[PDB]
Amino acid sequence: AFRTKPAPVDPSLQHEIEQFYYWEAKLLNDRRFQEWFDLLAEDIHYFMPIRTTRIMRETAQEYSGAREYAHFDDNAQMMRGRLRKITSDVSWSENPASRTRHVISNVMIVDGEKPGEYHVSSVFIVYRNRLERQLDIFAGERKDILRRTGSEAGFELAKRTILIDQSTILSNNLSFFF
């Protein structure tokens, strides 16, 4: 998948997928959550495994697996409920709202198995500031499957795996989206 170096892609494709991520970041950072949730595919799997500190010979166990506890591991129904909460005036974690920034780079694209689909690796810094002085800085990789669509966004998010560069979460909550 990203086992060997991705073949070169058309500059058109690189730019199209990059613009998709930059627009997605704008939706999240500007709290356009209705439009963000509309980017999610009906078959969305939104996954953020728990990461542990291991010695070398046991690094296969670094991430939680498929039937194991996780930070996020959601289908569309679960995510729809999260949208209902984060657009709510009695949602105390996000009212008042956090100020977030999603700085996206290192976009690498590989043709998926079905036409119109793409495997994408990219990296992020998420900077989250709230209330008076609270500041959490996150980084990680996002491994996505994007699927081309006729929405103004132009893709939908079929699959996301967030690989967070933290073991213990250095934040009191994870009340936003990666």
Binding site: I55, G65, R67, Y69, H71, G81, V90, N172, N173
Partner: protein, 425 residues
């Protein structure tokens, strides 16, 4: 702090809490000695370390420990600190080992924490008795899958420590002959609040869920009950009876149905000797003092680990009946992470509240007047035939007053003999 000065910080007669209990560094350090140093604390579940050599790290206060399965089935808990110069013996969170070697000077340990060799022992350590120089060992006892540890030889055993609270623990832990198991994976995160807010809330506070804290959580998933305060020991639990609304909103229709109708729930009623206990309890919260908390039904369980007075870590995992269908285990997995986790639609808000309370307590005037803990004062029944202990309506701070009173007792007792002398006749 003198003993009599600490006792004045809590008043279960009038219902008053001095907010300095959540901020004072001297009290905090005394809590590490007198509470965490001699209480039974949750280490996890037996099924997290099933095989010989399986280990996981954990905390007893701010002491890091190794929880390790031995060759004879035994579970040992020992300080994760080499006695030579203090190096962490193992830096991984978990795995399987045949031994542990200190990376600093190579003192080597078996899986039981015994020091078994020291490099150049013959020339440089002629007299050394290795059997006296291994890391401190905690007492380890289980209760129905849960592992607890306690450093203190003179503490009561786990069964006595839990006492009558076992009854309320069994609603989660004794519903089937198969027992429970932990779903693998432990979520760990950092909240800048005092441990006692968390401990209290899971001990006593259905009020917050029944009012405003979780309106948004309820929406994301779209009156009667009782509360138990331990006769002694600071444990508490509360639960709704008959009304599925909070349970359905938290855990969805599949889990709700598994918890209340059909063979598994009927088995629960049989084992617990009551249809009410097995099938009509809906959303229960519980704390085993000081820092083990869980929600029977939802089936999240966690240890709170103190990080000074202004910070905790939450270490959470989910347990399921070992004989539940695979589809039910998967539903428990997703619905718990969806709700009672760092990013969960309930627990997201639990920790925003705690964080703001603690930051406000920076203020001098914010620490200068007591908090109101008078809710349900004198509205108790210590002679309920179905429910042992001191029983209140589900909306009350009786269990909370019990937790803060146990806090006073531990904080003002130089040893367990003195603490045993505060027990009722």
């Amino acid at each position: 702090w003198a003993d009599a000065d600490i006792a004045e910080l809590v008043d279960e007669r009038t219902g008053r809490l001095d907010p300095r209990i959540y901020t004072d560094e001297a009290l905090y350090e005394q809590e590490l000695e007198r509470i965490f140093g001699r209480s039974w604390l949750l280490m996890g579940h037996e099924t997290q370390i099933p095989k010989a050599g399986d280990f996981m790290t954990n905390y007893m206060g701010e002491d890091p420990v190794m929880v390790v399965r031995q060759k004879n089935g035994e579970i040992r808990v020992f300080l994760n600190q080499c006695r030579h110069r203090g190096m962490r013996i193992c830096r991984a969170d978990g795995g399987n080992a045949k031994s542990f070697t200190c990376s600093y000077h190579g003192w080597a340990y078996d899986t039981g924490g015994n020091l078994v060799s020291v490099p150049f022992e013959e020339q440089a350590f002629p007299g050394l008795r290795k059997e006296d120089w291994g890391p401190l060992q905690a007492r380890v006892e289980t209760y129905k899958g849960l592992i607890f540890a306690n450093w203190d030889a003179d503490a009561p055993d786990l069964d006595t420590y839990l006492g009558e609270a076992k009854f309320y623990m069994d609603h989660m832990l004794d519903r089937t002959e198969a027992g429970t198991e932990a779903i693998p994976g432990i979520q760990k995160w950092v909240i800048p609040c005092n441990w006692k807010f968390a401990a209290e809330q899971f001990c006593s506070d259905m009020y917050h869920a029944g009012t405003t804290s979780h309106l948004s959580g309820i929406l994301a998933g779209l009156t009667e009950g009782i509360q138990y305060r331990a006769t002694w020991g600071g444990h508490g639990s509360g639960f709704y009876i008959g009304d599925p609304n909070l349970l359905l909103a938290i855990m969805g229709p599949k889990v709700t149905e598994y918890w209340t109708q059909g063979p598994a729930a009927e088995k629960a009623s049989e084992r617990l000797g009551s249809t009410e206990r097995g099938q009509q309890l809906m959303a229960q919260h519980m704390t085993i003092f000081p820092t083990c908390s869980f929600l029977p039904g939802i089936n999240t369980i966690r240890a709170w680990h103190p990080r000074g007075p202004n910070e905790i870590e939450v270490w959470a995992f989910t347990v399921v009946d070992a004989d539940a269908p695979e589809e039910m285990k998967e539903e428990y997995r997703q619905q718990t992470l969806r709700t009672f986790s760092a990013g969960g639609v309930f627990e997201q808000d639990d920790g925003e509240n705690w964080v703001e309370i603690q930051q406000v307590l920076r203020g001098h005037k914010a620490r200068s007047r007591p908090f109101n803990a008078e809710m349900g004062l004198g509205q108790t029944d210590s002679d309920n035939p179905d429910y042992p202990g001191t029983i209140s309506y589900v909306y009350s701070e009786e269990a909370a007053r019990g937790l803060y009173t146990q806090w006073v007792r531990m904080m003002t007792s130089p040893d367990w003999a003195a603490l045993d002398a505060t027990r009722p006749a």
